Design an enzyme around this catalytic site. Structure first.
Site, PDB file in Angstrom:
ATOM      1  N   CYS A   1       4.656  39.362  55.308  1.00 48.46           N
ATOM      2  CA  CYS A   1       3.671  38.553  54.396  1.00 48.46           C
ATOM      3  C   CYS A   1       3.828  36.835  54.814  1.00 48.46           C
ATOM      4  O   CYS A   1       3.451  36.498  55.983  1.00 48.46           O
ATOM      5  CB  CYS A   1       3.861  38.641  52.713  1.00 48.46           C
ATOM      6  SG  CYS A   1       2.596  37.951  51.860  1.00 48.46           S
TER       7      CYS A   1
ATOM      8  N   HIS B   1       0.705  37.375  56.351  1.00 48.86           N
ATOM      9  CA  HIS B   1      -0.425  37.273  55.341  1.00 48.86           C
ATOM     10  C   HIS B   1      -1.486  36.538  55.822  1.00 48.86           C
ATOM     11  O   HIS B   1      -1.270  35.550  56.660  1.00 48.86           O
ATOM     12  CB  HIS B   1      -0.041  36.698  53.865  1.00 48.86           C
ATOM     13  CG  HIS B   1      -1.039  36.927  52.591  1.00 48.86           C
ATOM     14  ND1 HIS B   1      -2.218  36.252  52.625  1.00 48.86           N
ATOM     15  CD2 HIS B   1      -1.282  37.860  52.039  1.00 48.86           C
ATOM     16  CE1 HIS B   1      -3.183  36.740  51.687  1.00 48.86           C
ATOM     17  NE2 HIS B   1      -2.267  37.923  51.285  1.00 48.86           N
TER      18      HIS B   1
END
Lengths: 188, 188
Positions: free
Chosen positions: A105, A125
């Site tokens: 992420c 992400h």
């Protein structure tokens, strides 16, 4: 004969991205240490879940080496990782001994801060892409899980299961990953 | 104008099934209380993750009512829920006021123990089916998420995201669920 994993837990970490790999990795028989960046005290994650680490990072550092070092995401958590000199030392040592480094992420952005794995294909992400790519030091991928050499990255909370199973497969093999996966009732 | 959720956390709960709904529900703007069955002290989940609850169940009981009561799974956690008289009272009250009751994996078996929602369609983990169906008091479904009246159930750790989003959709509506879902990077 037991593989060992270090999960580094800082204030503001994404708690789902922390718990899912820890749980899955322990289902796979891996010895996981959840190590708190700032000490042994409880850590307030991004959505206010409060987790007690297994050890301080200082203590855990002395009980290495680890077959995988795991960096969860969450924007403030990754920022705390990127600023920590202890993280830098741990990561640089893991890279030198060719051990696995896994980040999900926003977590991969700590790699950039610490000059880890330049030249590798990575994902983050979508919201962390611009930050990870400052300087052009990596090549970006939109795969949900990406693995290039010893660098394993993944995109967000919803990829947490695939990310964890990829760690299992790297450490313990495809058969163990498939055995741990079945009771979870994943879709694909 | 804020919806409220109670998550009941007992020793041996599946920590992924606890954290994922709490996190998602708080992303949706729901006020979640993680209430410890035995008190305010930290709770050792099934895979040794240790979580600090927000309050004891005794205190949280007094700050009701809640729009949803959430029962995580994990075999020992569900057993502790099924044995607790406080849980029975909370659930019976929630049923009488027609509030939502959500349980995942082994969690639904506490419903049976407490004689909650007989006649409803429910799902459980495959390994908990025989226990849930003792007596024929429910109808079983193999859907990953199942909702019949005020009873929402789901099957296992890998359905945790779908289960949580179904709670969001029930409380806050489909538009909010879709907005909270997009940043998670779920597959479907």
């Amino acid at each position: 004969a037991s593989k060992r994993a270090l999960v580094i837990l800082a204030k503001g970490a994404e708690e789902m991205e922390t718990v899912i790999p820890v749980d899955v990795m322990r289902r796979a028989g891996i010895k996981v240490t959840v190590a708190g960046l700032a000490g042994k005290d409880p850590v307030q994650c991004s959505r206010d879940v409060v987790i007690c680490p297994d050890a301080s990072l200082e203590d855990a550092k002395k009980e290495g080496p680890y077959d995988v070092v795991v960096l969860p995401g969450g924007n403030l958590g990754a920022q705390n990782l990127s600023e920590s000199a202890a993280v830098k030392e741990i990561l640089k040592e893991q890279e030198n001994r060719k051990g696995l480094i896994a980040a999900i992420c926003a977590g991969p952005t700590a790699l950039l801060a610490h000059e880890i794995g330049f030249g590798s294909k990575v994902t983050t992400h979508p919201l962390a892409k611009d930050k990870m790519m400052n300087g052009g030091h990596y090549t970006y991928s939109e795969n949900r899980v990406e693995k290039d050499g010893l660098i394993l990255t993944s995109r967000g909370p919803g990829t947490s299961f695939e990310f964890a199973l990829a760690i299992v497969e790297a450490l313990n093999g495809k058969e163990v990953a498939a055995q741990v996966k079945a009771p979870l009732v994943l879709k694909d």
